[PDB]
Amino acid sequence: NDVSKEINLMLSTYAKLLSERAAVDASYIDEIDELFKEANAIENFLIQKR
Amino acid sequence: EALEKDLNDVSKEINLMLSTYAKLLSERAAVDASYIDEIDELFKEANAIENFLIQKREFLR
Amino acid sequence: SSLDSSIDILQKRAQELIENINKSRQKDHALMTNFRNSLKTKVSDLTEKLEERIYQIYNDHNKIIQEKLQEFTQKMAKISHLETELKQVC
Amino acid sequence: GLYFSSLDSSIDILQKRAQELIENINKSRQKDHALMTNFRNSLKTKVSDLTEKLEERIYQIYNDHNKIIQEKLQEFTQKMAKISHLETELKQVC
């Protein structure tokens, strides 16, 4: 039953490798919102000046 | 979320699969162990008759 | 003929035992081939259901990434539009 | 003067920050596919090497089980030969 151990252990490490790589893309989506907020403040400056 | 119950039915297969295979070889080794002991029983029957004939030949000879 | 009876049973049970060992070795080969079929169709069906989910997770993100970035460019064009309108009045 | 130049500056930065972010995604998914495929093809060769170790241990069982039975039955046959030999010796003298 030692083979079933190493198989299940490599699957959990294979899942963490996906959850991390899925969290990296979740961070770059957050960096898109940061750029989307900086462009928001610039627009509000041009509107309130016009 | 979805990857949990797919993988929860992964470990439950292999840990069940290899557990049946572990018990399978424990039975297949028993079949060969019964055949080996079957030989030794057949060899004891012959060794009994062997000493029954040598002690009768030396009785006459 | 008593010894001719026991010796006959001894020599025949040896012939019956050899034919039985051949049956066990043929059953052992059947079990192993079926133990390979089960673990070649299982582990295969577990790489498919773990590749398509990774593909669909990145499929959903690529749609959102192309939604925010395309909306980000639309807002930057409006900023440059309003800036040029301010350069003209001045 | 100052107002329209500081606005073109912040926009040009957001132009680069948009271009730099897109280039990182194309470079992030590089390492996403360069590592996972180096773990997928890695785990395949490891599990296959674990079965080959087991399939050799199984061979050790049947290689020495056939050896023990083949050697005992070979001795068992020499025993039945020397018994059938002595019985015919007693069936002709008596």
Author numbering:
A (entry chain D): 58 to 107
B (entry chain C): 51 to 111
C (entry chain B): 61 to 150
D (entry chain A): 57 to 150
From the paper:
The synaptonemal complex (SC) is a supramolecular protein assembly that mediates synapsis between homologous chromosomes during meiosis. SC elongation along the chromosome length (up to 24 μm) depends on its midline α-fibrous component SYCE2-TEX12. SYCE2-TEX12’s building-blocks are 2:2 coiled-coils which dimerise into 4:4 hetero-oligomers and interact end-to-end and laterally to form 10-nm fibres, which intertwine within 40-nm bundled micrometre-long fibres that define the SC’s midline structure. Thus, SYCE2-TEX12 exhibits behaviour typical of cytoskeletal proteins to provide an α-fibrous SC backbone that structurally underpins synaptic elongation along meiotic chromosomes.
We obtained an alternative crystal form of SYCE2-TEX12 ΔCtip core, which diffracted anisotropically to 3.33–6.00 Å resolution, and was solved by molecular replacement using a three-helical bundle of the 2:2 structure as a search model. This revealed a 4:4 structure in which two 2:2 complexes interact laterally, through tessellation of S-shaped SYCE2 dimers, to create a molecule of the same length (14 nm) but twice as wide (4 nm) as individual 2:2 complexes. The 2:2 crystal structure is largely retained by the two interacting 2:2 complexes (r.m.s. deviation = 1.91), which seamlessly generate an SYCE2 tetrameric core with staggered TEX12 chains arranged on opposing surfaces. In common with the 2:2 structure, S2C sequences were missing from electron density, meaning that pairs of truncated SYCE2 and TEX12 C-termini are juxtaposed at both ends of the 4:4 molecule. The observed tessellation of 2:2 complexes provides an enticing mechanism for assembly of a 4:4 complex from structurally intact obligate 2:2 molecules, in agreement with our biochemical findings. The 4:4 crystal structure lacks TEX12’s C-terminal tip, which is required for 4:4 assembly in solution, suggesting that this conformation was supported by the crystal lattice. We reasoned that the tessellating interface likely drives 4:4 assembly of the wild-type protein and is stabilised in solution by additional TEX12 Ctip interactions. The crystal lattice of the 4:4 structure is a fibrous array in which 4:4 molecules are arranged in end-to-end chains, with 1-nm gaps between juxtaposed C-termini, and a lateral stagger. Thus, the lateral tessellating interaction of 2:2 complexes within the 4:4 crystal structure describes the underlying architecture of the wild-type 4:4 assembly.
